[PDB]
Amino acid sequence: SIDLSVDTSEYNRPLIHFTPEKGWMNAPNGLFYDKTAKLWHLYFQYNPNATAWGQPLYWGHATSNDLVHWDEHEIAIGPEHDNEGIFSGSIVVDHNNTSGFFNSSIDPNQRIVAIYTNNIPDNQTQDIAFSLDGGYTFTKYENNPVIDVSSNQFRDPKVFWHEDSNQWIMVVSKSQEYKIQIFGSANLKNWVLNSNFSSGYYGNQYECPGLIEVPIENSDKSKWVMFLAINPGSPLGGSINQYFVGDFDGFQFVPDDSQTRFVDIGKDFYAFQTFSEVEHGVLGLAWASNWQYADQVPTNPWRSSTSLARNYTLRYVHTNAETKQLTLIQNPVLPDSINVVDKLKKKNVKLTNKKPIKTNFKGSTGLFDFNITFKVLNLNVSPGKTHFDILINSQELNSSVDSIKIGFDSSQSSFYIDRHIPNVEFPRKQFFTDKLAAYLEPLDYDQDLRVFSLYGIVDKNIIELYFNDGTVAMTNTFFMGEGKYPHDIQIVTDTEEPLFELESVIIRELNK
Amino acid sequence: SIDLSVDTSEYNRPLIHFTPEKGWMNAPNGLFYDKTAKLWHLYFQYNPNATAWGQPLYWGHATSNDLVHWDEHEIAIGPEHDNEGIFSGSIVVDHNNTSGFFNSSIDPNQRIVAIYTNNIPDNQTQDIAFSLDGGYTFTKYENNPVIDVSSNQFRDPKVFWHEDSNQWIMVVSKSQEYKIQIFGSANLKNWVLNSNFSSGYYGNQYECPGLIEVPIENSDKSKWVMFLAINPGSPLGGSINQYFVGDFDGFQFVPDDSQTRFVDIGKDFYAFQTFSEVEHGVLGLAWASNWQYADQVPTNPWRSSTSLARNYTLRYVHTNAETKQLTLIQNPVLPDSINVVDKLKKKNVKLTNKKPIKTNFKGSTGLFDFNITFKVLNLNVSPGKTHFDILINSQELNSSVDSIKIGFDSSQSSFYIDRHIPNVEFPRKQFFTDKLAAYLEPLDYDQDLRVFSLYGIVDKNIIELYFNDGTVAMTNTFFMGEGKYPHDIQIVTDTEEPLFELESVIIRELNK
Ligand SMILES: *[C@@H]1O[C@H](CO)[C@@H](O[C@@H]2O[C@H](CO)[C@@H](O[C@@H]3O[C@H](CO)[C@@H](O)[C@H](O)[C@@H]3O)[C@H](O)[C@H]2NC(C)=O)[C@H](O)[C@H]1NC(C)=O
Ligand SMILES: *[C@@H]1O[C@H](CO)[C@@H](O[C@@H]2O[C@H](CO)[C@@H](O)[C@H](O)[C@H]2NC(C)=O)[C@H](O)[C@H]1NC(C)=O
Ligand SMILES: *[C@@H]1O[C@H](CO)[C@@H](O[C@@H]2O[C@H](CO)[C@@H](O)[C@H](O)[C@H]2NC(C)=O)[C@H](O)[C@H]1NC(C)=O
Ligand SMILES: OC[C@H]1O[C@@](CO)(O[C@H]2O[C@H](CO)[C@@H](O)[C@H](O)[C@H]2O)[C@@H](O)[C@@H]1O
Ligand SMILES: OC[C@H]1O[C@@](CO)(O[C@H]2O[C@H](CO)[C@@H](O)[C@H](O)[C@H]2O)[C@@H](O)[C@@H]1O
Ligand SMILES: *[C@@H]1O[C@H](CO)[C@@H](O)[C@H](O)[C@H]1NC(C)=O
Ligand SMILES: *[C@@H]1O[C@H](CO)[C@@H](O)[C@H](O)[C@H]1NC(C)=O
Ligand SMILES: *[C@@H]1O[C@H](CO)[C@@H](O)[C@H](O)[C@H]1NC(C)=O
Ligand SMILES: *[C@@H]1O[C@H](CO)[C@@H](O)[C@H](O)[C@H]1NC(C)=O
Ligand SMILES: *[C@@H]1O[C@H](CO)[C@@H](O)[C@H](O)[C@H]1NC(C)=O
Ligand SMILES: *[C@@H]1O[C@H](CO)[C@@H](O)[C@H](O)[C@H]1NC(C)=O
Ligand SMILES: *[C@@H]1O[C@H](CO)[C@@H](O)[C@H](O)[C@H]1NC(C)=O
Ligand SMILES: [Zn+2]
């Protein structure tokens, strides 16, 4: 039952991360681009009747021309009964009408088919539905389900057209068997199981798989990347996304190695999905929370945002001094529709305890970004001082300032976040990990000096960090006290002489 | 250079975890049992000259008849020069004198050979040394090194006799190539490279591998388990140990699957090694710290303990409701030579906010264990109350009590620890993760009610937790304020009616 009396929006509703106006949101679904309308479509696991997961569960729907400003629509798909759910799935555009649902009056770029998990008591099946109006309303296929294996742990179909083998491909999870199942189909209705894939960090269950061709930077080559969500049992606690790099022939995915790697090593990036019908590269986003505490965080009358849309590539990067690995790179999608309210620019700054960088903006939108390239100098300092810190400070409210801290330690070659906020309490905060680290090799070397970069964006209750031009991504929510939100940024150190040179510093106040 | 002026031993030196009397300890080495003398041997990476890592670096040495009472000996092996180190390695007993070092005056069970990494500037090699006095003094082999591949990233040899292929086997890490190399030898001097193994979570580097037959519970069969340390780049930050289950023929290790699993999901369990010459089962221990902060924790005039000795088996356990996996099990070695100073024993207690469990012991050793079997009842409580907490409280000093918290949440089916202690500060505490969790399936079901077990031991500055009879292990150090150490244990809940029934509760104060 949503309490419309208490609205936390003013201080903790993100400006450029999608949130439903009210109710509960989890996994993003049916992500696609309408080439005719030039519209991005976001669907999502949606309970409008509470700020927690519940059935009946629907596909919510929003559209955007630029992946930052969203317009929320009426519910797109709903269950047959109150004790049922339209669980996760995906959308394809059936340009050549292989499904037989579309006539000449439906533009080929708008021949929209949803493939989703129908959840009923003791049964999960893969069902389809078609939209004749650009993805706003759907008709369920008469002969659903299209796949039934008599299981209650069988969900999250990601479907794509595979040109090379001239067929539809589904990757779907046999969740508690720890198997990604690869099915093939000529018409999206009649499916054949081609192979099973089992690898990486199993945790409790497999969920929301994905399989897509990702370009290698500065080349004409590409690799197939298999995405996989696990929850619970993440090594960081709760829910997390992992990936595998290799090749696909339409029947089997063959990884290049047997290594485990995570997509994002924050706590709050789960159920990642890619957009269908992108013409250049790979774009996707995730649900920006963690199953451990998502339904308890102090937001109202909604819970959950998505991450920003991110652009995915592969790059050879040093994982140690000697060895390079083909690694998943992600950078945020931030178009010119984002307004810069104010900015601080500094160059070649030798950081010390008497030379802090402090923003002095007139007001605050609660939306900021910081772009920093730094070099570690050859200075011996005591071990408590081998670091610098970016402080994100609230306004002073009732005599107190709340803040979160993003730092780098030169002795550990590791970034860290501390999202610990004194006095803010909510159920299951025992699982709300406060301190997270990311080890990185230098981005570059300036003679013998190690060079690193960091891009960060803060949007009222969520922070996204991208280290070394997207080599590592870390997504984390944070909850300041009632009425408090980000207002100013400081960069500080305790070193008396310079250990860090900030070659370039850009801190901007942004708005929609 | 160690200050003997300040000694923290009284409040934070463990009683039954080995610590050097003074200086720095990291990885355990040369672990073996002398069947003739009936003595367990522990060697360790040792810097006597500071409470941080430094060269010259030695093998320290201690012995025990029972794996809890340790006698520290003279340094066993030292480097040729001050800018060199005797890095990690292992010991075997050359019963049949394959090496030719041992005549009829040396009992077969005492034909002790150390295989270790010799660290010199820009070079790491595998060297051997032999002991004619039961492992107290060593003579380096005159034709060292026994393996040189012209690398400065080539270390941590674990050697064993393989009967099936009638040869010595060495597993060693080509650290920055992410390879465990398997070599073979008739005589411990002349080696042949047989295979390279690469899998699991790579992080920054491969270190301290092991390969051993682990018995399957209730069976005469076993599996080959490959152990692997990575540091830095643990998904929990810093250093961690992982394992692989499969088969070995003397030349190649073949895992049964391609899954990644960690040995211990605490922050402070690294460089795990197994004892040689164990006749019943598999025994091992690790370094009980994390490279991120190990050299900064507030102990003096030593830093670091080992973990307890643990007993390793394989058991088929539910990782989800549907599926069992052959899983590494570990339980602590705690013999009857440990005195029970006092204990609290309770049976069939329905836990509520008016019925807390509280120890009322006359004094404190700072050494306690708690053994609990609990059951989750069918009670609906508000989301903030779906849990119970074990509080480990210091004595009141300067008007405050320091505490650490171990809990279970029935909504998340997860254990958690909070080792956050306010007002205790030390360098690199930004990496000192305070909140850790572990998801488990129930140990058993009583009709429809979920049953779980938990064994924990607190030894002044270290806590070891074993969930569901050793299904999951979690090791963490903790640092209370100056003079404070564990004094009393409480078990509490906020539920007004019973959510948890404690079938069995045993809390003991222990001593040497
Ligand atoms: C680690 O745990 C294992 C159990 O998984 C323990 O192994 C058991 O150890 C006892 C000896 O302590 C063995 O009993 C012996 O059996 C032989 C004949 O089978 C008999 O001749 C001896 O008199 C003795 O009773 C027992 O068989 C063995 N169990 C298994 C399954 O191997 C081991 O002791 C534990 N180690 C420590 C130090 O706690
Ligand atoms: C995501 O990144 C890719 C490049 O890595 C961008 O792709 C380029 O897009 C332009 C048109 O916008 C094309 O003319 C180029 O040929 C593309 N390059 C490659 C190598 O494909 C893509 O535009 C990015 N998308 C977003 C939304 O940022
Ligand atoms: C962060 O800063 C870097 C500059 O250091 C930006 O990268 C440059 O982007 C421009 C386009 O705006 C390119 O022409 C340059 O070649 C890039 N140079 C470098 C140094 O990368 C980057 O776009 C910034 N990131 C943001 C705003 O998110
Ligand atoms: O809304 C269901 C949708 O979410 C996912 C991924 O988060 O599964 C979540 O919800 C399920 C039902 O409560 C849980 O079984 C699952 O553990 C949880 O992650 C998708 O798998 C599913 O389609
Ligand atoms: O003492 C060296 C010994 O420790 C290990 C494992 O912890 O390596 C540690 O020390 C090395 C030298 O400082 C580092 O290169 C390494 O990263 C660190 O883990 C063993 O690998 C080594 O034999
Ligand atoms: C849930 O929300 C839907 C969509 O607005 C509404 O029509 C329905 O009555 C609600 N049902 C329950 C059981 O709350
Ligand atoms: C084509 O489909 C549309 C639905 O969009 C329907 O109204 C029309 O009658 C159909 N007939 C044609 C165009 O063949
Ligand atoms: C894939 O897994 C399913 C479910 O366990 C099984 O029925 C099927 O035979 C497997 N198929 C292949 C080709 O491995
Ligand atoms: C280091 O310790 C050893 C062994 O106790 C000692 O003999 C040596 O002099 C010390 N060296 C330095 C450099 O302090
Ligand atoms: C055996 O070795 C011992 C110890 O090194 C030595 O005292 C003795 O001379 C040796 N015996 C023979 C026959 O060489
Ligand atoms: C094993 O790795 C080593 C070192 O990288 C390499 O030279 C050797 O050829 C490899 N051997 C095999 C059998 O792969
Ligand atoms: C804990 O309790 C169980 C069941 O009573 C017992 O068998 C076990 O030995 C105990 N564990 C320890 C480490 O004392
Ligand atoms: Zn605090």
Numbering used by the authors:
A (entry chain B), B (entry chain A): 24 to 535
List sentences from the manuscript.
The β-fructofuranosidase (EC 3.2.1.26) from the ascomycetous yeast Schwanniomyces occidentalis (Ffase) is a robust glycoside hydrolase (GH) that releases fructose units from sucrose and inulin (hydrolytic activity) but also produced 6-kestose, 1-kestose, neokestose (all trisaccharides) and blastose (disaccharide) by transfructosylation of sucrose (transferase activity). Ffase is a butterfly-shaped homodimer of 160 KDa included in the GH family 32 (GH32). Each subunit of 535 amino acids presents a bimodular arrangement with a N-terminal five fold β-propeller catalytic domain and a C-terminal β-sandwich supplementary domain linked by a short residue segment.
However, only sucrose was observed in crystals grown in the presence of fructosyl-mannitol, most probably due to traces of this disaccharide in the purified product. For its part, the glucose at + 1 is recognized through a complex net of direct and water-mediated polar linkages. First, there is a bifurcated hydrogen bond between both oxygens from the catalytic Glu-230 carboxylate to the O2 and O3 of glucose, these atoms in turn being also linked to Gln-228 and Asn-254 side-chains, respectively. Moreover, the Ffase-sucrose complex shows several long-chain residues in the environment of the catalytic Glu-230 that make a complicated network of polar linkages, keeping a tight architecture at this part of the catalytic site. The complex Ffase-D50A/sucrose showed that the pair Gln-228/Asn-254 is additionally involved in donor substrate recognition by making direct hydrogen bonds with sucrose.
